[PDB]
């Protein structure tokens, strides 16, 4: 359901982000 390396994680400020672990980049918007 969630692509390998892609993680849905939140920051303690209440902001959710998708982190791609292979490219190790922070993505805010859903790439679809």
């Amino acid at each position: 359901f969630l692509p390998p390396g892609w993680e849905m994680r939140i920051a303690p400020n209440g902001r959710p982000f998708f982190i791609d672990h292979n490219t190790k980049t922070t993505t805010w918007e859903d790439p679809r």
């Binding site: 672990h21 190790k24 805010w28």
Partner: peptide
């Protein structure tokens, strides 16, 4: 634009 913090690695998958 929502502030983006420089990627820090949280618990690895």
């Amino acid at each position: 634009r929502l502030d983006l913090p420089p990627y820090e690695t949280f618990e690895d998958l």
